[model samples]
Target: GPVNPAENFRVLVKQKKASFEEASNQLINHIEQFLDTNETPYFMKSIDCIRAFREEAIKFSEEQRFNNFLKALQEKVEIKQLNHFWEIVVQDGITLITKEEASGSSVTAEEAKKFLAPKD
Candidate 1:
């Protein structure tokens, strides 16, 4: 059967008795699978399933839980893979480096450096 990791997560969410650690494991499974596949539209599928996860059961407390999961993910993936996921999902060029920044960050006053061509 095709695994829906988010569905597993939602079930765990509904169970309430299931430990948060279990949910985090399932989320990692889902994310790893998402990264492994070479097909398009899977990213969109990820968005759908994660949205389902939130709509089905994620509560305010789960916010911190997911934050913890993100740290686990960063540890698992390489920087190149991380930035690939980061590149498209942004307003500016800033990537969320910390979990605190994921929730919110103080505005910084740095100017964007222009990319200059190499000198001959």
Candidate 2:
């Protein structure tokens, strides 16, 4: 299942004005709930979800305790069996960015001209 940890956590923190600690704990509980119900294949997806969530939390606050908790949560998901998936995820992200750049740079001349034309 696809999860939006970044936006989800931000909503909890920003919209609800929940403390960082509360938000982080709630998010981890949700992830654990997912893990308990889901099958083995979804484990990798859960790990990626946690990584995304951690990035959002770290960017929002520099509190060491919260950061350490996130690090521990991240490590918990990094089981030996699912370790190889991390490499695949990183490569996929790089490949996606490269493909996006290539496509952006390949705009047709006509399209570029139309886009650059002034609206009179």
Candidate 3:
């Protein structure tokens, strides 16, 4: 058989049934990492993406749990706005850093004064 990509993705986003704050933070941090800098201005995905995340067996509480996460993300972006730190990745084999779009500047991650966090 085959290694299930869906199963693996769930583990990547799994929580340890910890506190609301901690679990929520972990969820948000995970998402913030897998961002697309090209669509800067600190944009976020829709609330209907629960399906994209994992299986449908997840209860509404689980959905609400992650809803808290997305809320945190929105709050953070509002504080930072254009300074939210977004950059377009130049990918190859091992995923290399490339120019940042929000800055309208062409420079490597190390070269940039600030770097956006990687995608989840």
Candidate 4:
């Protein structure tokens, strides 16, 4: 069964049950666990979850939450996992950049670009 962990995360965050740091940790855990499996769908699903989280963070004007998540993601998640699905994540990354630019977020455009850059 395909589970929507992102929805659960959204609920937790929206209900104020979890702070941004807690939610960020949970999301990172899910992503790491998903990527540990051989299931390709799970990989893509995790990426989708990230995109959803990004949008929601922006919607709520929780700039720190999104920034924390981005930092935690970069530190904890493997670049190979993301690069494997770079096509999808890259698009969302660009969208993130655009959204951040429009909103004048604390996250710099250079940071977002560096996050999406391929690491060898």
What lDDT does the true structure give each of the candidates?
A: 0.48, 0.51, 0.37, 0.64
User: What TM-score does structure 4 among the candidates reach?
Assistant: 0.61
Per-residue lDDT tens digits for candidate 1, residues 9-42, read 7677667577666676667567568767945666
lDDT of predicted model 1: 0.48
TM-score of candidate 1 relative to the true fold: 0.48
Better-scoring candidate (TM-score), 1 or 3: 1
lDDT of 3 by residue, 1-120 (tens): 775333444555464543334434454454454454435333343121223441222232243343344345445665766334322121211121223322233444543322334554
Candidates ranked, most accurate by TM-score first: 4, 1, 2, 3
Encode model 4's per-residue lDDT on 1-120: one tens digit a residue: 766778877787778567667776777787778877857788677777777776766766464566665566555445545545555566654444334443665566666665665674
- Where is model 1 more than 4 Å wrong at Cα? 1-3, 49-58, 68-78, 91-120
- By TM-score, the best candidate is 4
Q: Tell me which of candidates 2 and 3 scores higher on TM-score.
A: 2
Clash count, one per candidate: 0, 0, 5, 0
Clashing pairs in 1: none
Candidates sorted by lDDT, best first: 4, 2, 1, 3
lDDT of 2 by residue, 1-120 (tens): 774765677777778577677767776777667667657666665666556564553344533443355345435547534444445544444111111223234334443343234463
* Candidate 4 or 2, higher lDDT: 4
Q: How far is candidate 4 from the true structure (C-alpha RMSD, Å)?
A: 4.4
lDDT of 3 at 95: 23
Supply the global lDDT for candidate 2.
0.51
- Model 4, residue 115: what's the lDDT? 61
**Which sections of candidate 2 miss by over 4 Å?**
1-6, 38-41, 62-67, 70-120
